[PDB]
Amino acid sequence: KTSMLTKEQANKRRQWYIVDAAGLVLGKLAVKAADLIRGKNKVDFTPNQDCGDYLIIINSDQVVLTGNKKENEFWYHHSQYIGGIKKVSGRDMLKKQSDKLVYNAVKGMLPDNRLSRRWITKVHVFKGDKHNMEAQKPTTLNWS
Amino acid sequence: MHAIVVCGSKQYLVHENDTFFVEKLEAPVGKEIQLDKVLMLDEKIGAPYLEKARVVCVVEKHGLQRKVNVIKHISQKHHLKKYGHRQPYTKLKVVRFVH
Amino acid sequence: MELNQLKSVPKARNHKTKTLGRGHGSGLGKTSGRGQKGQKARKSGLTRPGF
Amino acid sequence: MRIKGGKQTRVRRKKWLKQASGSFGTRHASYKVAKQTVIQAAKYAYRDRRNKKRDFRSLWILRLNAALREQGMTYSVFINLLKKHNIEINRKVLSELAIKEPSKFNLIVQKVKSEQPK
Amino acid sequence: MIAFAKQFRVRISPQKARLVCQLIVGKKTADAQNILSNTPKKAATLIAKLLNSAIANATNNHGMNGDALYVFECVANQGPSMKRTIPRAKGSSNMITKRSSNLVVKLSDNPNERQELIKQQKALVKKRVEGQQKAKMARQKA
RNA sequence: UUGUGGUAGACGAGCGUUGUAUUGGAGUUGAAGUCAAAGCGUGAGCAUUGGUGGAUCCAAUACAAGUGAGAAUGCCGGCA
RNA sequence: UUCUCGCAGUCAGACAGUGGGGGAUAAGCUUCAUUGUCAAGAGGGGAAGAGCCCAGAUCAUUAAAUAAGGUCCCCAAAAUA
């Protein structure tokens, strides 16, 4: 027999954060956003207690897609009907709804789970410099 | 204050007056055993193992773990074998850390 | 030997009886040692001697 | 001599039923479904003992990897430095140190960092 | 202090009687009688008779106040069935199962009556453990 | 020291049921049955206590079997 | 793995590599020779796969080093040029 390891008993050290996606790549921003949301980078990681900090993303429309992906890569959404497959190009996503694009990209990098719903909830993505989230006093960190 | 001992094959971090469970040591209850292999003690950590660093422990009980039923079954192959295991342990509490 | 403790010479009385119907744990369950679905596994038997 | 079955079938059946206690509906009531669930549960328990031995190692590796990235060092080089310095400590106890004894865990990383190998 | 009344082999089915019994559990005496006297169901003029008999033998036999009685539990247990052969078409036949219910109504005066039942269960468990300890003491003594 | 995956199959060692023969023992101060519980065994299996029950049962060594049920669109009874 | 005696089961095979026949250098086709696996064999890789690769499960351990394979996230683990 042996000594069991310490696991957090639903302890919430969660904090609020701010990042600026002025010129960040979509994938490079999404991977670090997922890591921050899951709390994998935290010293004590108990993978059933959602010990991950909140995150707010500013300037979503200002993100970039390298190469010809703004006109050659398509995002697909199918309703339960026939023919309800809506397609949007990279440029159209970058203009019409950029917040949804970043939200979907971050969601895709999470495990199929019942906690991933709460994890994707803790991502507040905005398309402008303004945000109604200044009451949380969120700390500012770059490229995360 | 703390030490890293190696009883059996596992490594235990032990404080003063801490009771941990190890594999059977063949020692009667009540004796004063001296664990030899010590990795880290206080702040001086020896690379293979610390020399002369001894962990003094007292054996509390020699009980057995919970019964485990191993039922091997090969589906649609006329093979249903059953077995039981009750692994013996020994519980010991740290008394003093030899300098 | 008394009538309350009477014993045979070892390896003279009791030998392993091959019970053909009592479970697979004895190695003689289900099929009971006949094989599988052929003439020798039916109730008839092993045909004729010399056949 | 007509031997009649009674208390033989029921006892061995109730053992299986007792093992399958806490199941969903008929999986604890009927002997047949209870027997199947116990066998399947035994298979699961066997497989998950092996898988527990591997999954807890992975969790310790993850925690240790995280604890190192805060200081600028990586897991792949930390273990190499540990080997060259002859230090032999489980990732379990090392992770337990980084969660319980931050100062002493930092002491181990400081020695493996720069001190002469052996 | 539970008073009760019973009725074996009631013609109503347990399925159609539990629907009416759930309308009176936990209700006061007068209100339960009022509710059951104006419900257009067959299993309403039979539970009413059982309820009235239970009130009578609670305030006469067991000596209860009569203004504190509430319906503790009214249930319709499964009674013995009767098998008949219904002639089907093309020479076939089916089995009609006439269902009967064993009705029982119980009323109490104390609004904490469940606690005493749990207490009796606990007392039985305690006596079992006490017997085990005395047997252990006897084993070590020898 | 070399080993211990396993179907068809071969070999060896055991458990359990009923009864009989020899010994001993328990039982209206409560036997069998029967239910529950946080026990013991490597496995068939074996105990302890309490409730119900109201008269037989247990241990050892041998012997004889209508001696071991999850499946046969299996039979009967009950209930979904 | 040779000889003697007792008791068998097996006579429907499958796929992968290699050399061919039949087919059309088609078949997850059919028929042979040989090396392996499955049948009767779990584990890891192949996203999922009986037969491909690494190997052979006595039971327990929340110990360590490795094979095929891999190290942005899902998912354990990398950096330089």
Add this chain to the structure above:
RNA sequence: GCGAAACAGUACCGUGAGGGAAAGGUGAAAAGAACCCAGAGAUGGGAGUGAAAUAGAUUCUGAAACCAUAUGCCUACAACGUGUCAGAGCACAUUAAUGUGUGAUGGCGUGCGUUUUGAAGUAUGAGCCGGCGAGUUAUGAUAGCAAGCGUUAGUUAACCA
């Protein structure tokens, strides 16, 4: 066990020959519940007899499937062979045991027999529970093991007591 422990070759099926069931146990003794209450009554609740009435004629014991009631835990954004390994919180306290009941959440996970090269199987068999249900006997042959008797050995069958 005779099909038939009871009034069984009966009930019942068929024009007929013919086919053919199920069903036992109150208590030592009926002392079988007078009487009161509710109800139309059966009946139920008391009273009484009895050692026992949760032995009450539904009459020895009373298992499971099945149907209801309740203490405690969980459950209405949730992809589920229903379990397993970890795991908070909640509620208790035992064949005193690193205890028990539930399980927010994380990782893994396509039943059992049959027959097939190959079945999670869009092949097959089982609605569930309980009982019954399939390697025997007689006479001989061979082989293994063991015992008795032995080198002019060994052993009786029928039958008699």
